[PDB]
Design a protein around this ligand. Structure first.
Ligand SMILES: *[C@@H]1O[C@H](CO)[C@@H](O[C@@H]2O[C@H](CO)[C@@H](O[C@@H]3O[C@H](CO[C@H]4O[C@H](CO[C@H]5O[C@H](CO)[C@@H](O)[C@H](O)[C@@H]5O[C@H]5O[C@H](CO)[C@@H](O)[C@H](O)[C@@H]5O)[C@@H](O)[C@H](O[C@H]5O[C@H](CO)[C@@H](O)[C@H](O)[C@@H]5O[C@H]5O[C@H](CO)[C@@H](O)[C@H](O)[C@@H]5O)[C@@H]4O)[C@@H](O)[C@H](O[C@H]4O[C@H](CO)[C@@H](O)[C@H](O)[C@@H]4O[C@H]4O[C@H](CO)[C@@H](O)[C@H](O)[C@@H]4O[C@H]4O[C@H](CO)[C@@H](O)[C@H](O)[C@@H]4O)[C@@H]3O)[C@H](O)[C@H]2NC(C)=O)[C@H](O)[C@H]1NC(C)=O
Ligand SMILES: *[C@@H]1O[C@H](CO)[C@@H](O[C@@H]2O[C@H](CO)[C@@H](O[C@@H]3O[C@H](CO[C@H]4O[C@H](CO)[C@@H](O)[C@H](O[C@H]5O[C@H](CO)[C@@H](O)[C@H](O)[C@@H]5O[C@H]5O[C@H](CO)[C@@H](O)[C@H](O)[C@@H]5O)[C@@H]4O)[C@@H](O)[C@H](O[C@H]4O[C@H](CO)[C@@H](O)[C@H](O)[C@@H]4O)[C@@H]3O)[C@H](O)[C@H]2NC(C)=O)[C@H](O)[C@H]1NC(C)=O
Ligand code: NAG
Lengths: 130, 108
């Protein structure tokens, strides 16, 4: 019921690679852009990745620039993130979130400058240790 | 690059009274601000977007305000449920945006 679930994560030593998965339940996965966000223990959150609804655009923060790769598949309704070359500063909990704005309209008659709502539904997040 | 700083990151306040939080930006961000609230063991919800707009199904004690680079968020009659951690998020370069650091309110 308008929920996301997360899979992956655990204990892992540096110099390796993981792949986390986020499965969507009911709403849709072909009309919305998704986010990957993380939070380190003792700190606040930080946006790490954004992906479009059709995959026409992908953005990452510079902290995980290069060694990270985001993707999705709508028919299976799941968003995957591959993280290689881990660093001992990437020990944190990760969530996936949805955009409270439709994707195809977001630039034509649905413009984000006027009618953007932030992020309606969140996940629960899995922990990763380096 | 734009980064915002919330203060104080810790404010212990008794239930029942009014309290206002502030979040100022490095450079002027406009009106592209969102107020997130996170409770442990519970998904986070959006409180205010457009830097002053109460989202639907939100009680009528939360009220945002301010523009430019000095934004504020006020609660009127803080009760038991209002104990969480709050963040100010910006999207001046949508879809890419940065967060704040947070503010965890407590009881005296
Ligand atoms: C101009 O301008 C203007 C201004 O600016 C504008 O307007 C705007 O618009 C927009 C657009 O449209 C809008 O928005 C919309 O809305 C709608 C509504 O609905 C609903 O709502 C509410 C709720 O809300 C909540 O949620 C949401 C989501 O869901 C969000 O968004 C919001 O914000 C909120 O949030 C929240 O949530 C949660 C909690 O809960 C959390 O988590 C978060 O964070 C937050 O907090 C509700 O309440 C409502 O209800 C109401 O109403 C109705 C009618 O309508 C009724 O019936 C009821 O009863 C109620 O009532 C009440 O109120 C009224 C008023 O209103 C009064 O009167 C009475 O008395 C009472 O009081 C409703 O129900 C919505 O819907 C939407 O959303 C959607 O979409 C989107 C996109 O767009 C997305 O994102 C989302 O998610 C959703 O989605 C959905 O849908 C779609 C389509 O259909 C699909 O696709 C999907 O998938 C989904 O579906 C799914 O899910 C669901 C769920 O349940 C289900 O159902 C289904 O089935 C599936 O499953 C949107 O939001 C707005 O509002 C407006 N504003 C004003 C001020 O108005 C315009 O537009 C312009 N124009 C031009 C031309 O430009
Ligand atoms: C009524 O209905 C009408 C009908 O459509 C609506 O009309 C719309 O009005 C808005 C605003 O007036 C128009 O938006 C303007 O778009 C232009 C062009 O943008 C395109 O071309 C540029 C190249 O010049 C691309 O770079 C743009 O792509 C960027 O942005 C999109 C989303 O905006 C994003 O998906 C891309 O990935 C890319 O983002 C990257 O670059 C941006 C910087 O552009 C960066 O910030 C971000 O982080 C990414 O790195 C896009 O393909 C744009 O030039 C305009 O202004 C922009 O530049 C000025 C410069 O000063 C900035 O101040 C401003 O903030 C913007 O950044 C507007 O964005 C829209 O096109 C138009 N629709 C149509 C179909 O014409 C009305 O809005 C409706 N009115 C009401 C009241 O509802
Ligand atoms: C409105 O947008 C213009 C465009 O740059 C900006 O200069 C001005 O400060 C903005 N004002 C408000 C109140 O958002």
């Amino acid at each position: 019921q308008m929920q996301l679930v997360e899979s992956g994560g655990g204990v892992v030593q540096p110099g390796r690679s993981l792949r986390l998965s986020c499965a969507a339940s009911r709403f849709d996965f072909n009309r919305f852009g998704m986010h990957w966000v993380r939070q380190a223990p003792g700190k606040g959150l930080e946006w790490v990745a954004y992906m479009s609804y059709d995959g026409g655009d992908r953005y990452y923060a510079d902290s995980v620039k290069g060694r990270f790769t985001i993707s999705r598949d709508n028919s299976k309704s799941t968003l995957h993130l591959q993280m290689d070359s881990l660093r001992p500063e990437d020990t944190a909990v990760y969530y996936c979130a949805k955009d409270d704005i439709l994707g195809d309209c977001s630039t034509s008659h649905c413009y984000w400058g006027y009618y953007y709502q932030g992020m309606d539904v969140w996940g629960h997040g899995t922990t990763v240790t380096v | 690059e734009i980064v915002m700083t919330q203060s104080p990151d810790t404010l212990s306040v008794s239930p029942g009274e009014r309290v206002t939080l502030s979040c100022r930006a490095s450079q002027s961000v406009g009106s592209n601000l969102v107020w997130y609230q996170q409770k442990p063991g519970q998904s986070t919800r959006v409180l205010i977007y457009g830097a002053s707009t109460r989202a639907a199904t939100v009680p009528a004690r939360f009220s945002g305000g301010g523009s430019g680079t000095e934004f504020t968020l006020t609660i009127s009659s803080v009760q038991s449920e209002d104990f969480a951690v709050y963040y100010c998020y910006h999207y001046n370069n949508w879809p890419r945006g940065s967060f704040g650091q947070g503010t965890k309110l407590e009881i005296k």
